[PDB]
Write a protein that binds this ligand. Structure first.
Ligand SMILES: [Cu+2]
Ligand SMILES: [Cu+2]
Ligand code: NA
Ligand code: NA
Lengths: 620, 620
């Protein structure tokens, strides 16, 4: 009965039927995106209306459409034709990936390039990559993918070990034309293999690891009701899944006594961008918007018990649409479990004689996705003490190139002749805040150093300052690790027992933001990534920091256009957008398969509670 | 047979006997510090010589002595009388703690202050705190403790909830004289209790937590030999314990094929300072050097199975000396165990069809200490992939004060009338490096942004720069989170298969350093804490960043005096000193007992290995 329940196979089949009868899903149509819409603000009228948003592509060249459908009422609510030269192309379709390699295999220019390198075309894999917006006027309004080539010596070979540098092609995947083939010169194809399951490379496997058994004899401490509503250790929330964003957390609240207190209305990773820092023309266009261009949810892995998720695991299997509107289940796509997390609080008091120790635990909600050579884990954590944390885990195989004779300022050497271009992995977390309700404000908190003198005669004092962000035009903020800068989201109308506004403090990792020149195409398309924190006034249609249609979109849709409205954010319904990322200079240890590296952020209560919220945790 | 074995009870009893026969341990003597000396450099002569360093205090006022003893040969090697006005006082003795409260209970000025506040002297606990060096000329060369008062309403009451503000006393603990009693005015004593085991405060305990059982059916994967030598998943090390520093890690090495490769010769937390930022004269002198003044190892907790350390735990019980030279065992003072640590590496490859997942684990070595109201956990982690990490866990009860009418810029309100002064907790890690041997160097690595233009036509390139620190005078470095600054420790004479120097990269958390005015007493005494990174040339006697005798020492002994020698550090035997800390603005949630907060650092391999070192990990 909950409006936040996961989409069912029956709902998706009904959407397909509604579209087909409306004449909107003929044989030339493909669904590029399908997802449920969240309820509107103030939906307390109980009038449930399950609506779905659909992007419909046309493989014959006709204009795509954006369609909203009510499964409740069985009707098309709206259907708008899109001018993609203006508002952006639709996300990349899975079926367009294979088109690139197939089209190149019959192109005379491509074959000539492969012949010069003595490469069998049957052995050449082509990575189909998003195109961006650069200098090529003929690409305006067309669906372009760019392709980079890798050699697979045999069917089980890791092609990433054998990049074919000096060669790139551009493909129109609708007209099925190879627009350009660029060959800047022959590089030797690196010859060493990168097969991390080959005994020749691994050596004999270790026999020294003894098992660790994690069990829950009485089952887990959380409950799952209505398919996706979670209650755990005073936390209450709904776990959503969207094919673009992946796992989305709704209605995060904490049961404090007999009050259910809201904290975050919606939490998601609303964009992620991977920009490459190699100036070679073979790769200087390379930027992945994994969320906005590829849709990370549709490539979620099925997670294996004992291997991907260890312990007493409760799975969700979200349902998505395929390109034809058929429901497709991602079996075991979401892992949920609780984990011991060490000491929570401890004190041995000499005067009282009381020795006290309590243990911490966290609830984990996670999924994993694979996009080409990259694999990303998305982890949300809830802790006993009210802390909320997000962690991204990056692994997979690094994207490779030739390593040039004479070295490079922009590429690392991984093996003889084998390089890995510098790049970043940057995320945007969209946090639709609801600290004790919707009237919230953000303050920036800096440490304040004080000079020795009157009132500070020994020169030991220090303090802090808080600045309220009152309008969107002043709510674009940068990190300052040296001054311990954090941001507090508070409710000025809800006070704790000391008559202070209740709040939560955002702790960032203070990693570098986007490094590209501010005048670059990627800086314009990923403007969100140039600053650590943005605050907007909530609006229904301001969902993504990059806009609705990211693929081949020139710039002018997302956060910079939202904040130009300069809306009041002082005690209002607000959304915090936090940018955070990894800057990756690949090391030898990242090859041939990369150990996990992590980045994230956390929110901790700041006078939200009247005292420690974990005094009622038992002694274990 | 190992020279790095833990001190035995028999060794300590022999030291006691050697001292007594030498006439150095009469009834007026107390041992303030006793510890084993590490072997000298180049001890490959196998000529073992177990030597102990002892600080001997005299309760009659005679000069203390520093004594070195050989238990091997049964002789006093040297014994020097100390001029404490020059070189500093000895660490605080446990038996001097109780002296403060007892002496104040009979002082007419103290009693008058308590009478004005209607406090029963039998209910007043006095926190005995280190004195520092300030304006009081009569303190030069005397052992002073300062006392702050708290009311205990009944024997099991938490006195921290009832600070007696406006009152401080100074005590000479040798002459047994109260030198000064300062009363700046009556503050109400906060009345609410802070008893976190009282059902009135906790409410009914939760019944919702289901057990998590962590077991190892075949036992742990590590082995312990020679009492303290650890082998685990290619790591090899020796776990030492010193009464001042606590757990010390020796001879950290990694078995790469058939080579045992050194990484760190000695790792320890060599100082920690807790400076308070309240300018009130009642507390503006307050700075704890927990390591150097109090000796954190002697207050190590006995750690309880299932509560402090969960899983298949292997304990060490280090032996220390009491004040009279008797051996004292700290039962179950060190926990060692391995922990699952999630996904290590994962890739699902479309082209090869191979799906690959491996799990990570870490080895944990930890101890907990309690100093008054504060409890600190020290955790060392070794990971499969070669990462080394340290984490400090801070909990216990926050130090309190009155909350002034009209508020404070330097104190947080925790409960009606109850305050908590701002403060920091800053650590110094001393890392005697040995990356593939002792010829090491440090480079500072910054991200480099590049401007759009020729050779970077699309404005996407970025790079990095490395600066070698060649002499001590240029090796005092600051963090720069915005430029992604890290430090690489490399061996210029040991190269990987790509002919690059092998190395390890230090990743700091980039938290604020010491906030006090540079002209303050604490900035002079804790100069190490004003900068993030120092590199020195190794020397036997340069053990602590604050010098050997920190208590009441004016300044002029530690890192600033070492680096003035301006020694060559480019490809030499070097020591890295990393400062890192928490800046604590107490929150309501920290009361009445504080949930753990953490800070730390880590080192990751940087071309140390020829490829990923975890390819031989099995599928689980
Ligand atoms: Cu990367
Ligand atoms: Cu603190
Ligand atoms: Na909001
Ligand atoms: Na060294």
């Amino acid at each position: 009965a909950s409006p936040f329940r996961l989409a069912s196979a029956g709902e998706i089949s009904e959407v397909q039927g509604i579209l087909r009868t409306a004449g909107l899903l003929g044989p030339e149509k493909r669904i590029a995106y399908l997802g449920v819409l969240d309820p509107a603000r103030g939906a307390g009228s109980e009038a449930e209306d399950r609506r779905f948003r659909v992007f419909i592509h046309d493989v014959s060249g006709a204009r795509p459409q954006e369609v909203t459908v009510s499964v409740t009422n069985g009707t098309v609510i709206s259907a708008v034709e899109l001018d993609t030269a203006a508002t952006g192309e639709l996300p990349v379709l899975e079926e367009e990936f294979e088109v690139v390699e197939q089209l190149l295999a019959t192109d005379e220019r491509w074959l000539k390039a492969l012949a010069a390198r003595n490469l069998d075309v049957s052995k050449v894999r082509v990575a189909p990559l998003s195109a961006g917006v650069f200098e090529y006027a003929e690409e305006r309004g067309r669906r372009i993918l760019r392709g980079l080539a890798f050699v697979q010596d045999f069917p089980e070979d890791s092609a990433w070990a054998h990049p074919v540098d000096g060669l790139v092609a551009y493909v129109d995947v609708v007209s099925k034309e190879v627009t350009r083939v660029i060959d800047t010169g022959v590089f030797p194809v690196p010859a060493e293999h990168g097969n991390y399951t080959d005994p020749e490379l691994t050596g004999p496997l270790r026999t020294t690891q003894k098992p660790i058994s994690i069990t829950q004899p009485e089952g887990p401490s959380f409950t799952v009701t209505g398919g996706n509503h979670i209650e755990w250790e005073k936390w209450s929330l709904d776990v959503g899944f969207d094919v673009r964003e992946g796992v989305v957390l709704h209605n995060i609240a904490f049961r404090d006594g007999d009050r259910l207190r809201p904290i975050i209305n919606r939490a998601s990773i609303a964009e992620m961008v991977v920009p490459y820092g190699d100036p070679s023309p073979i790769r200087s266009w390379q930027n992945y918007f994994d969320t906005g261009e590829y849709l990370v949810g549709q490539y979620a892995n099925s997670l294996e018990l004992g291997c991907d998720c260890l312990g007493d695991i409760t799975y969700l299997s979200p349902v998505i649409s395929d390109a034809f509107g058929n429901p497709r289940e991602i079996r075991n796509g979401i892992c949920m479990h609780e984990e011991d997390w060490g000491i929570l609080a401890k004190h041995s008091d000499l005067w009282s004689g009381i020795n006290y120790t309590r243990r911490n635990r966290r609830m984990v909600i996670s999924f994993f996705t694979t996009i080409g050579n990259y694999d990303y884990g998305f982890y949300w954590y809830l802790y006993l003490d009210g802390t909320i944390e997000f962690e991204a885990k990056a692994t997979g195989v690094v994207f490779t190139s030739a390593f040039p004779e004479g070295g490079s300022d922009n590429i690392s050497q991984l093996a003889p002749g084998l390089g890995a271009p510098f790049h970043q992995h940057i995320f945007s977390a969209r946090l639709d805040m609801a600290i004790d309700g919707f009237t919230n404000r953000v303050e920036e908190e800096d440490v304040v150093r004080q000079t020795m003198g009157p009132g500070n005669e020994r020169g030991n004092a220090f303090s802090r300052k808080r600045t309220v962000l009152t309008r969107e035009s002043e709510a674009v903020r940068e990190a300052d690790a040296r001054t311990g800068r954090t941001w507090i989201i508070s409710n000025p109308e809800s006070k704790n027992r000391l008559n202070e506004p209740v709040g939560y403090k955002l702790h960032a990792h203070n990693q570098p933001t986007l490094l590209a020149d501010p005048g670059s195409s990627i800086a314009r398309r990923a403007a969100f990534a140039t600053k650590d924190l943005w605050v907007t006034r909530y609006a229904d249609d301001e969902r993504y920091p990059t806009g609705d249609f990211v693929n081949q979109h020139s710039g002018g849709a997302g956060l910079p256009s939202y904040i130009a409205q300069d809306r009041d954010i002082d005690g209002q319904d607000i959304v915090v957008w936090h940018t955070f990322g990894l800057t990756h200079f690949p090391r030898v240890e990242d090859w041939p398969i990369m150990p996990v590296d992590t980045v994230g952020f956390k929110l901790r209560p700041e006078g939200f509670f009247d005292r420690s919220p974990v005094l009622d945790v038992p002694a274990n």
